[model samples]
Target chain A: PDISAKDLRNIMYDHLPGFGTAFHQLVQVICKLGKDSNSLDIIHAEFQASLAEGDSPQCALIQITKRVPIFQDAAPPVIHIRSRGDIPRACQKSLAPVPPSPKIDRGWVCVFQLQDGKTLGLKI
Target chain B: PDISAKDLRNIMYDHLPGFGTAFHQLVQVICKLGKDSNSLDIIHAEFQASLAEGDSPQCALIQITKRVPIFQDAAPPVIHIRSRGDIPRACQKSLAPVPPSPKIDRGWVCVFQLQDGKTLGLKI
Candidate 1:
């Protein structure tokens, strides 16, 4: 089985709530550089910055198993996201205060003792 | 390993306690008419019937696992999803009120269960 859009989003969303949208932001910045640009160096710095900053950072680290795509030629498509038009849609659609979701309900301690029985590249 | 759109929405937001915009209505009723069309007939029938009866059914029984994109045509890219115009364009801008996700969770019900866990794909 090969990956589709569903797979990557799940990696983030499964890792945590904030990760999903944050990945979108990652892609958002990434997609800005078109196919010709090879500077994933800068992008990863930003993405790593974004990933580190947003989400629960450890979950970000764990969820980020697939690292190849960050370096590969076949990154996602360009910015067809907002579909620029008159009256500035991005501003108009800023209606609801994007419900400031609680950071972590799992009660992740700032200082932690990590003990999950991870077997292979996984835990059970 | 290859995947662009976050690995097929992380296999439907990690198989349980679902999230995300109901996955672009399961790839917008499965584009590329030559591929994955069986569910459409069933979904269409049920959908129209629901329209007639003025209600909805228990959604469509659509559980999307991955396939290497067009029967092993590079297993990931039919011709580079990043090549644009299939997944990203409309999918990211998924205007919702969508079909409630057809839930079977881990794609087991469609592919028949076996002792060795090799699903019997007799008539999929």
Candidate 2:
């Protein structure tokens, strides 16, 4: 499972077929974005899901607050999308059809974590 | 940059604004999804950008694949999206208007890294 630097190069050069100019350019973009505070981080990289279940918003929030450090420690920032049979009573206000999936009646409750150490969710 | 667990707890309880029921529901969805193979990982969660800058498909692939380990080894799989400016000289076959943002034509160069140790992208 371990590869030396030289080994890595050899592998890239060998099996990589034809890929030199493109990679050189991508390095530039990554380096340029590195200066930004929002540069992709592990936390930011993890695309989590937010659901709108249960009729009572309070009940659902309390249950989920039991876990997920991001939500438990702060106002749960999540987008609720409903794609199914009866729309949950609590999620009737914000119902949007799931974009990619037409069959499912999806409601997106988007919770955005802004760089300013705050969060909010839109009931779409 | 370090925070005590006690501080974390107090922080969660205080100034959480008003997000209880919604937060509670999201916690369950996240928890249930956690058991799945493709449950959002830090690597998976990061929403990266891929541009079609050069004329050659090889160029875009090389640049991004160079840095993204997921791309370098096998085949640099990435979706190409076009947003603004007479389109990149490289993208013509696959062009899409950046959704939610008109005037700005955004082409999604989606590269999906599946749990089955495979990756591929479409020039949407």
Query: In TM-score terms, which candidate is top?
Result: 1
Docking quality band of candidate 2, CAPRI definitions: incorrect
* Candidate 2 per-residue lDDT over residues A65-86, each given as its tens digit: 2332333223212323333223
For every prediction, compared with the true complex, DockQ reads 0.02, 0.01
Writing each residue's lDDT as its tens digit, candidate 1 over B1-124 gives 1232344333324432323222333332232321343233333344345445543121221212233122221111112222212333322222111112221232111122234433221010
Model 2 lDDT tens row, B1-124? 1223243223323422343322222222222232231222211111111111111222322332233223323321232333323233333334333332121011223333345444333232
For each candidate, report what fraction of the true interface contacts it reproduces: 0.00, 0.00
| Runs off by more than 4 Å, candidate 1 | A1-57, A65-67, A70-124, B1-22, B29-124
Candidate 1, DockQ to 2 decimals? 0.02
